[PDB]
Amino acid sequence: NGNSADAAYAQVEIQPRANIQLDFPELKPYKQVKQIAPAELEGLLDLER
Amino acid sequence: GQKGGQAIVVHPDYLYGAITEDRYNEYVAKVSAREKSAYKFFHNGMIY
Amino acid sequence: VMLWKEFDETIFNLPKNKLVPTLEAKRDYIISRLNADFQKPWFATVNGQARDLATMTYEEVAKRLVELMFIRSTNSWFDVTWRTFTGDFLRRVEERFTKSKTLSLIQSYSLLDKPDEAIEKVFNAYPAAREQFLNAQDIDHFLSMCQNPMQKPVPFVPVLDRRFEIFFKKDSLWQSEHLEAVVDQDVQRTCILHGPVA
Amino acid sequence: FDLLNKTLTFETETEVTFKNANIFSSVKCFGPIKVELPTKETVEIGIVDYEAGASHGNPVVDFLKR
Amino acid sequence: NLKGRPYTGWVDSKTKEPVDDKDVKAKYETSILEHSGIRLIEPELFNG
Amino acid sequence: MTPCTVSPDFVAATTNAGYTIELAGGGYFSAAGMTAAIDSVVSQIEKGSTFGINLIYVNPFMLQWG
Ligand code: NA
């Protein structure tokens, strides 16, 4: 059948390269993050302090 | 020399409870942009 | 050609030591004029907004390659080597964003003959790459693929550096016969050679 | 036939027809298979019989060569 | 160029032979661990 | 003329119109590439027709295969 028949057969493998990340924290959607803290906290703190 | 110390660190997601949805979403956008730029800076600074 | 003329009188005549400083000073203007007026646009411009390779996502780059190299009107890659380019580029995306050895989602660059779908396939598997600028190493790899001499000169300027004149002037005769593959099929961008007396 | 510790010889002719410069349209490879006796005399014990359409090669000669 | 062929990526600092990220662990991890963390004091790191 | 008379079609058309034309080496990068274009011109022109080739002296790579 020739080296053609079994060259259009043999899959192509992908080896990983490193992709170093800064790992900034994940920001969840507001609806979900507002459940964590009490409802009352909104506008209660001086955020400069 | 009697140097006692304690710090308490609280999870950062307790902060976002204090602000409005509008303000949070603006922050999330701004961080996301800054983070992409920091990754750009870091990898360039590392290899060179 | 009038931009080409200005750049002859303004940039390509400057002594080598003054080339790179003038390029950095007029950077935004040069990009603006390439995009507006020339047959090789600034590669790194996304939704008509100027960028650099370093400030485009893997997805933005893959899409920009298809935008400039794949001719919608003829539903084909203007040259097979341009397909090989964006094929090799997508394989890099898989390499960078896979966490371990797997089989490529592009087993044959044939798949690129429906390019929109090829892109969706790869970035659906590696969605992280929609949200991250090019790793600095992959910028150098992209710019290296652009120097590949076994391939039709890339139809854009990927970087402003010492070799700007070669990027600008290289392979600029064919566009007048293949407007279908020029940015707005716009004659006004292209080199047509013609005598003033004939 | 007990083949163990025997020496076989393969006396083979191969007839071929062509599709083009590279691909054969047909490939035939036949001839007797012989066993060596204690006397060193080779004796027929069977036959090679290969027949094929479009091939790129003769897999009998390839096998016997290796 | 690395021996007339063009190359982008890691290279062993001594040999200047190219190195794939996939091989970094097999090639260097044993040495990384041997010469990281709490270990015998290496004089070249503290002025002899 | 590079963009213009690189096209084997236009070379054949001009040759078939009964006028001498130069096939432009300018648009070719290998012996194999031009051999294919020449073959196309030959296939399109009448028996006993002819054309010429233009090579650029200032391009030593074209000269060395050309
Ligand atoms: Na990875």
With 0-12 / 13-18 / 19 or more C-beta atoms within 10 angstroms meaning exposed / middle / buried, residue C118 is buried
3-class secondary-structure state, position D36: strand
Which pair of tokens denotes residue F43? Answer: 């296939």
Q: SS3 for A22?
A: coil
With touching defined as 3 or more inter-chain CB pairs under 8 Å, the answer for chains C and B is: yes
Q: Is C180 on the interface with E (CB under 8 A)?
A: no
Give dist(CA C105, CA C103) in Å, integer.
7
- DSSP secondary structure of C14-57: S-HHHHHHHHHHTHHHHHHHHHHH-SS-BSSEETTEE--GGGSB
* Segment (H or E) for C6: helix C2-10
Integer CA distances (angstroms), A49 to A34, A44, A45, B26, F55, in order: 21, 12, 8, 21, 79
Residue of C nearest to E6 (CA): C144
Residue with token string 């990068």: F29
Give the integer Cα–Cα distance in Å for F6 and F14. Answer: 12
Find tokens 């003769």 and name the residue: D58
CB < 8 Å to C147, chain E? 6
- Residue A14 touches chain C, beta carbons under 8 Å: yes
Nearest to E19 by CA among E39, E40, E2, E31: E2
d(CA C119, CA C90): 8
Tell me the C-alpha distance between C96 and C125, whole Å: 12
What is the C-alpha separation between C185 and C156, in angstroms, rounded? 15
State the maximum Cα–Cα separation within chain A, in Å, rounded to a whole number.
Answer: 78
Rounded to 5 degrees, φ, ψ at C76 are: -155, 160
Resolution of the structure, angstroms: 2.8
Contacts (Cβ under 8 Å, ≥6 apart) of D11:
D31, D32, D34
CA distance C81 to B44: 29
Does any CB of chain C come closer than 8 Å to the CB of residue F35? no
Chain C hits for B37, Cβ within 8 Å: 55, 133
Q: Which of A20, A25, A38 sits opposite B17 (nearest CB)?
A: A38
Task: Report the distance separating Cα C87 and Cα C115, nearest Å.
Answer: 10
Q: Of A8, A14, A19, which has the smallest distance from its Cβ to C102's Cβ?
A: A14
Q: CA of E20: which chain C residue's CA is closest?
A: C95
With CB atoms and an 8 Å threshold, state whether C177 touches F3. Answer: yes
**Considering only CB atoms, which chain C residues are within 8 Å of F3?**
173-174, 176-177, 193
Cα distance between residue B18 and residue A42, in whole Å? 4
Measured in whole angstroms, the distance separating CA C31 from the mean position of its chain's CA atoms is 13
Rounded distance, CA D64 to CA D52, Å? 18
The token pair that represents F40 in the structure block: 């196309």
